Amino acid sequence: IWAHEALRLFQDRLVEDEERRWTDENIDTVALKHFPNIDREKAMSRPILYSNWLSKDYIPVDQEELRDYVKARLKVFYEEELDVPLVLFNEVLDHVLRIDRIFRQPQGHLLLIGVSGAGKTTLSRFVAWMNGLSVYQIKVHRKYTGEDFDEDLRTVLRRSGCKNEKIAFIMDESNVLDSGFLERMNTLLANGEVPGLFEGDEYATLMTQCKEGAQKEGLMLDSHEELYKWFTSQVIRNLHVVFTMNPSSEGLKDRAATSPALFNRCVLNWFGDWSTEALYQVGKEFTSKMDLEKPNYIVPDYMPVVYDKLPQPPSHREAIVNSCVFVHQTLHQANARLAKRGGRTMAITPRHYLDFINHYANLFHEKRSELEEQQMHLNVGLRKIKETVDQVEELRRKVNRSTALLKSLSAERERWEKTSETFKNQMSTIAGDCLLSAAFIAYAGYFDQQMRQNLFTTWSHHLQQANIQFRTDIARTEYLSNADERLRWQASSLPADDLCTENAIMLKRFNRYPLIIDPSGQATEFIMNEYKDRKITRTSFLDDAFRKNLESALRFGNPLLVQDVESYDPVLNPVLNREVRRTGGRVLITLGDQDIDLSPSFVIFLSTRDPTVEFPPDLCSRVTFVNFTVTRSSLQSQCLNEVLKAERPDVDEKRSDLLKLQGEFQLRLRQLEKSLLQALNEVKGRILDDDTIITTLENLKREAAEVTRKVEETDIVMQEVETVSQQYLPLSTACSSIYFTMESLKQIHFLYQYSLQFFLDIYHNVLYENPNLKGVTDHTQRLSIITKDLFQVA
Numbered sequence: 034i035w036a037h038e039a040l041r042l043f044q045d046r047l048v049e050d051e052e053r054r055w056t057d058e059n060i061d062t063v064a065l066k067h068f069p070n071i072d073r074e075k076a077m078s079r080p081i082l083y084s085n086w087l088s089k090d091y092i093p094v095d096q097e098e099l100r101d102y103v104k105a106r107l108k109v110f111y112e113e114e115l116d117v118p119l120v121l122f123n124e125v126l127d128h129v130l131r132i133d134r135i136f137r138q139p140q141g142h143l144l145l146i147g148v149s150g151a152g153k154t155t156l157s158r159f160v161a162w163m164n165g166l167s168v169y170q171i172k173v174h175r176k177y178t179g180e181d182f183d184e185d186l187r188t189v190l191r192r193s194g195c196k197n198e199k200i201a202f203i204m205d206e207s208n209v210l211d212s213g214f215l216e217r218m219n220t221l222l223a224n225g226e227v228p229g230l231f232e233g234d235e236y237a238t239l240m241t242q243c244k245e246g247a248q249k250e251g252l253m254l255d256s257h258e259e260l261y262k263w264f265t266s267q268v269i270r271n272l273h274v275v276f277t278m279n280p281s282s283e284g285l286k287d288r289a290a291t292s293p294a295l296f297n298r299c300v301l302n303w304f305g306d307w308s309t310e311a312l313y314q315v316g317k318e319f320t321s322k323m324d325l326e327k328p329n330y331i332v333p334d335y336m337p338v339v340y341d342k343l344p345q346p347p348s349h350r351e352a353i354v355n356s357c358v359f360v361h362q363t364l365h366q367a368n369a370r371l372a373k374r375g376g377r378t379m380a381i382t383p384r385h386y387l388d389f390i391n392h393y394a395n396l397f398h399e400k401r402s403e404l405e406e407q408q409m410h411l412n413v414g415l416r417k418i419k420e421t422v423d424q425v426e427e428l429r430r431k432v433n434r435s436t437a438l439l440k441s442l443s444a445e446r447e448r449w450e451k452t453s454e455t456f457k458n459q460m461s462t463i464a465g466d467c468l469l470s471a472a473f474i475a476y477a478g479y480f481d482q483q484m485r486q487n488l489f490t491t492w493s494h495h496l497q498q499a500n501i502q503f504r505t506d507i508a509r510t511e512y513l514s515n516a517d518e519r520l521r522w523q524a525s526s527l528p529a530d531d532l533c534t535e536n537a538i539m540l541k542r543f544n545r546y547p548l549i550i551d552p553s554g555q556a557t558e559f560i561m562n563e564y565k566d567r568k569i570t571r572t573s574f575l576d577d578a579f580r581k582n583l584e585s586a587l588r589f590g591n592p593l594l595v596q597d598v599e600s601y602d603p604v605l606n607p608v609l610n611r612e613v614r615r616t617g618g619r620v621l622i623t624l625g626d627q628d629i630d631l632s633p634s635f636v637i638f639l640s641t642r643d644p645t646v647e648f649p650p651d652l653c654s655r656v657t658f659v660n661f662t663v664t665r666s667s668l669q670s671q672c673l674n675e676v677l678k679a680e681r682p683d684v685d686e687k688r689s690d691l692l693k694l695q696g697e698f699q700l701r702l703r704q705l706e707k708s709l710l711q712a713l714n715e716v717k718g719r720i721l722d723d724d725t726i727i728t729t730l731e732n733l734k735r736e737a738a739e740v741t742r743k744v745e746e747t748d749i750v751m752q753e754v755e756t757v758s759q760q761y762l763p764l765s766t767a768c769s770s771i772y773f774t775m776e777s778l779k780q781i782h783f784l785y786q787y788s789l790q791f792f793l794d795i796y797h798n799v800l801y802e803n804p805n806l807k808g809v810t811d812h813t814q815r816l817s818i819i820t821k822d823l824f825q826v827a
């Protein structure tokens with residue numbers, strides 16, 4: 034008991050792990066120095082836990098028994114008030130025990146300092162429900178004022194003191210908009226009452242209520258002073274205040290002077306971020322369902338160490354989970370390097386790790402399912418072809434059709450064998466591929482292409498050193514997307530470059546409702562065009578009708594696009610966190626005070642036109658960043674297209690239609706391929722069924738005709754077009770260099786802020802509004818004039 038109390042009073046507030054280790058060592062050292070004959074293992078066993086849930090007394094418990102009890106209680110909790118599944122690991126057990134300990138005291142006030150999204154609020158809600166404490170959380174909005182806060186304080190105090198109901202009052206660093214909020218908290222936490230809160234008639238009514246309360250307890254109180262004293266005692270008894278903060282320096286010392294009652298009346302619990310331990314246990318527990326079993330795994334000699342207690346035989350599953358925690362950890366080094374050289378780094382909350390693991394699981398399940406269907410179709414096709422070949426050989430011992438089909442079916446068999454051999458390697462490397470894919474989807478949405486590539490390279494190097502099999506020399510934007518949806522996106526006016534394709538990939542496979550950083554309106558229109566069928570609605574936080582449209586979009590299931598997110602309304606805080614209640618057969622979600630029946634089809638997108646905006650970490654944990662930056666290659670391609678449209682319009686129009694037709698030929702070739710395979714697998718006629726042989730030779734004729742046409746157009750027409758365009762490419766290079774010099778100009782001077790539209794106007798003026806070009810018809814002189822005038826006008 035002595036050691037348990039020493040740990041709860043000397044190590045909860047510690048920040049670094051070194052200090053925690055020092056405290057844990059010196060507890061044992063002191064106990065051994067004073068007690069020289071005690072048995073260490075019966076008193077100093079490492080998982081010192083104490084709880085009174087299992088029994089009627091505050092006895093020690095065991096991790097496994099407590100884990101089972103907590104699991105059962107969470108199962109009841111979900112059906113009771115909050116259907117958000119959790120993962121249980123050692124830290125969650127310790128923290129729920131600490132929070133219950135504080136909740137049991139009369140004036141039990143808590144201060145949970147830890148990264149956003151780490152589970153502080155939901156753990157407090159869980160344990161408060163366990164102990165029967167009604168939870169109260171103020172609903173902050175755009176017009177939330179100090180008077181609104183005082184009204185909530187009056188209500189919570191009236192319910193605590195009068196009517197004698199226990200309350201857990203949960204507050205956040207974001208809820209304290211003004212300093213008057215912190216002054217009222219200071220007095221409430223230090224004295225159990227706010228003098229001057231109740232004034233005029235309110236006070237009288239309060240006194241009336243207080244009198245009633247005494248009549249409930251049988252006390253005979255009549256004076257307005259003793260009634261107030263009794264009310265203060267009741268509030269000291271039935272009211273617990275919980276505070277959550279981010280572990281930021283210069284914010285704790287600020288609060289140590291702004292409201293010192295947070296350091297003398299509140300128990301400080303330093304949650305911090307999930308430790309390497311916690312990441313390891315959540316990784317393994319969530320990925321347990323996934324098939325990460327590799328019997329022929331080879332352990333490398335110099336494996337890298339991330340989790341210290343990694344089993345000395347690392348199985349495949351352990352290696353995968355170790356790589357998962359490595360992927361999460363590398364984002365912190367990336368942010369540190371970014372902040373050291375420049376800045377604009379966001380916060381890597383544990384909700385990022387939850388998204389990464391969930392993406393890994395879903396993607397592994399999906400890609401495993403697709404490979405199996407394709408391989409089964411290929412195998413049955415090969416079996417049917419072998420059957421018909423043997424049948425024809427027997428019949429030879431009428432036949433012209435057989436040779437005609439065999440003419441193409443021979444190469445069909447060859448490439449089928451090739452694909453079967455290749456895709457069996459894909460099955461081997463599915464784990465590493467899906468790991469890298471989900472990691473990129475979850476952790477690179479905000480970074481630019483150089484940073485995304487560096488992250489991918491580091492993850493690949495780690496997977497290589499850990500002997501994990503991932504298919505290299507491939508590009509992610511193909512592994513995560515098919516050509517059909519790529520065509521559908523491009524029909525939605527999506528720019529045609531890798532960054533935009535993968536941004537749309539993120540916008541399709543999203544767990545946390547995305548936040549779009551588009552300095553232009555391209556992503557905004559792209560979203561509008563895609564969700565136009567589903568009747569997406571455009572609303573803004575600045576709009577006063579935002580709440581009306583939000584409620585409508587939630588209760589009817591229509592997608593919603595919101596701009597100007599710098600003015601984020603905390604009304605969305607539940608919706609982003611998906612705090613849903615599956616009660617009465619329906620899903621209910623709470624906005625402010627009103628509860629509404631959510632529809633499963635509801636989708637919300639948030640967006641902003643400012644790329645140089647810093648968001649608070651509470652928002653940074655609830656959204657998926659999708660940053661639509663501009664790349665060198667995309668700018669070069671747009672500039673080359675523009676100069677070809679202007680200088681040689683005929684070639685541009687030719688190139689435009691030719692490229693448009695090339696896309697349709699690959700589409701139709703894939704469709705004929707699918708129809709061929711489906712027809713082979715569905716029918717039960719090798720050579721006897723003419724009704725099935727008339728639909729397959731014509732298919733080969735269409736295939737041959739279309740391949741001939743495309744090899745004709747993509748080689749002859751595209752050659753001359755490419756030769757025409759390869760002379761304007763120095764202009765595009767020198768045109769992107771100046772734009773990126775302009776963008777870099779903001780570093781030396783804050784006033785030098787230039788947008789892409791500005792340089793585009795420069796370039797359009799140089800092309801279509803150039804007086805020095807009036808009269809010149811030769812293309813070489815025109816190009817020289819264009820480049821000189823671009824430099825000068827810029």
Ligand SMILES: Nc1ncnc2c1ncn2[C@@H]1O[C@H](COP(=O)(O)OP(=O)(O)O)[C@@H](O)[C@H]1O
Nearest residue numbers: 117118119120148149150151152153154155610
């Ligand atoms: N240990 C955990 N296991 C699973 N989900 C978690 C865990 N911790 C936090 N979450 C997720 O975080 C969301 C709410 O986080 P919250 O507790 O509000 O963050 P904070 O602790 O900063 O208040 C929930 O939707 C939940 O899914």
